[PDB]
Amino acid sequence: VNQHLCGSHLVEALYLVCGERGFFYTX
Amino acid sequence: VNQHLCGSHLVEALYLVCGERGFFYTX
Amino acid sequence: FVNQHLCGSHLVEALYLVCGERGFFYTX
Amino acid sequence: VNQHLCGSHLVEALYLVCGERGFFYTXK
Amino acid sequence: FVNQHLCGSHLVEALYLVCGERGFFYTX
Amino acid sequence: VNQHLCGSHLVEALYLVCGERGFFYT
Amino acid sequence: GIVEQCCTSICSLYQLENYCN
Amino acid sequence: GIVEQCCTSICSLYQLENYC
Amino acid sequence: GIVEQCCTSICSLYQLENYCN
Amino acid sequence: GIVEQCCTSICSLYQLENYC
Amino acid sequence: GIVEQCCTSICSLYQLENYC
Amino acid sequence: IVEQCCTSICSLYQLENYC
Ligand SMILES: [Cl-]
Ligand SMILES: [Cl-]
Ligand SMILES: [Zn+2]
Ligand SMILES: [Zn+2]
């Protein structure tokens, strides 16, 4: 479950950093 | 700027809904 | 409104912090 | 505490999933 | 404005990630 | 890395509680 | 409602505390 | 797309599931 | 029970639906 | 110290108010 | 100024780094 | 991304690889 929570923050971070380029997420 | 904020909630929603399938995002 | 939906998301987080042990109800 | 943090995500999740029905939350 | 208030929430989250070890100050 | 995650929730909480006074994080 | 009051003007923690329990 | 559809009107979980 | 059920193991959307109303 | 104080045990609203 | 600058137009990570 | 950044804190440059 700790991984699931971290994933939520990870996806938020990618959204900010990647900007116009966008990003991809998979487990 | 509202589009930028909505995008943040959008990726969080996609993260929960898409699960194992994962997803792609590009503003 | 889409803005209302976004605001609601922040509202439930706020209630979660403020209400503590009492818990809460939310309905749009 | 990890439980307090988990609760925050759970409430966000309930908000999206329950939609118009709304939901209830209490940390017991 | 309520919209300013919501935006601020995202701003503080962003500063937390970007500023890292340096930390930051916030005042509305 | 649990502390880093906790920090994210901490700043969100400080933002709501402190209101007009604002707050500091380091 | 909470949405009517707090999504039109900024509600404080004390204001929000009314919707607990 | 998703931004046009879900930031102009509230999308449901099922609506969002299409972009997975 | 949601904290006990969903904070020890990952709950699915359907599992979470039990706490709606 | 907030990380030391509030990430090991749940801090209350009053406790958090110290960091305002 | 951060609210004025970043809530009226989208601020980047580099732009935001100024308020650190 | 899960393997690298959920066991240790990833930096902005490190995370940018998943863009
Ligand atoms: Cl928002
Ligand atoms: Cl967390
Ligand atoms: Zn979290
Ligand atoms: Zn928001």
Side-chain angles (χ1 to χ4, degrees), chain A residues 1 4-9 11-19 22-25 27, chain B residues 1 4-11 13-19 22-27, chain C residues 2 5-12 14-20 23-26 28, chain D residues 1 4-19 21-27, chain E residues 5-12 14-20 23-26 28, chain F residues 4-19 21-26, chain G residues 1 5-20, chain H residues 1-3 5-12 14-20, chain I residues 1-3 6-7 10-12 16 18-21, chain J residues 1-3 6-7 9 11-13 15-20, chain K residues 1-4 6-8 10-12 14-17 19-20, chain L residues 2 5-6 10-11 16 18-19:
Chain A
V1 170
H4 183 60
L5 299 183
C6 175
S8 173
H9 290 275
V11 156
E12 167 72 79
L14 288 172
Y15 176 79
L16 294 175
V17 171
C18 296
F23 69 96
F24 50 85
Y25 188 83
Chain B
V1 170
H4 183 61
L5 300 184
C6 175
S8 172
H9 290 275
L10 280 179
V11 291
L14 289 172
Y15 174 79
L16 175 73
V17 54
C18 296
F23 66 97
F24 271 27
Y25 190 85
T26 42
Chain C
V2 170
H5 183 244
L6 299 183
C7 174
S9 173
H10 291 275
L11 279 181
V12 291
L15 290 173
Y16 175 78
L17 174 74
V18 175
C19 296
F24 67 101
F25 269 82
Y26 190 88
Chain D
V1 170
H4 184 245
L5 299 183
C6 174
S8 174
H9 290 275
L10 279 180
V11 158
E12 168 73 80
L14 289 171
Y15 176 79
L16 260 23
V17 172
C18 296
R21 300 189 276 173
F23 67 96
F24 51 85
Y25 190 85
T26 174
Chain E
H5 183 59
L6 299 183
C7 175
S9 173
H10 290 274
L11 278 180
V12 158
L15 289 172
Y16 175 78
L17 175 74
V18 172
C19 296
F24 67 97
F25 270 27
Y26 189 85
Chain F
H4 183 59
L5 299 183
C6 174
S8 173
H9 289 274
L10 279 180
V11 291
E12 285 273 271
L14 290 171
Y15 176 77
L16 293 174
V17 173
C18 296
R21 300 188 276 173
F23 67 96
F24 50 85
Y25 190 87
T26 43
Chain G
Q5 189 189 3
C6 300
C7 287
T8 299
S9 53
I10 300 183
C11 287
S12 68
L13 288 73
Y14 302 99
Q15 268 163 333
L16 287 172
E17 200 181 6
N18 295 330
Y19 302 102
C20 299
Chain H
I2 185 168
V3 163
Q5 187 189 2
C6 301
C7 288
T8 299
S9 177
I10 299 183
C11 286
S12 68
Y14 300 97
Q15 267 164 333
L16 287 172
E17 199 180 5
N18 294 330
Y19 300 100
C20 300
Chain I
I2 184 169
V3 293
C6 300
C7 288
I10 299 183
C11 287
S12 68
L16 287 172
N18 294 330
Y19 302 99
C20 300
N21 64 4
Chain J
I2 183 169
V3 163
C6 300
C7 287
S9 52
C11 286
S12 68
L13 290 179
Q15 267 164 334
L16 287 171
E17 201 180 5
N18 294 330
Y19 300 100
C20 300
Chain K
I2 185 169
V3 163
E4 301 79 323
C6 301
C7 289
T8 299
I10 299 183
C11 286
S12 68
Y14 301 96
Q15 268 164 334
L16 287 172
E17 198 182 5
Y19 302 100
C20 300
Chain L
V2 164
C5 301
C6 287
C10 287
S11 68
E16 200 179 5
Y18 300 100
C19 300

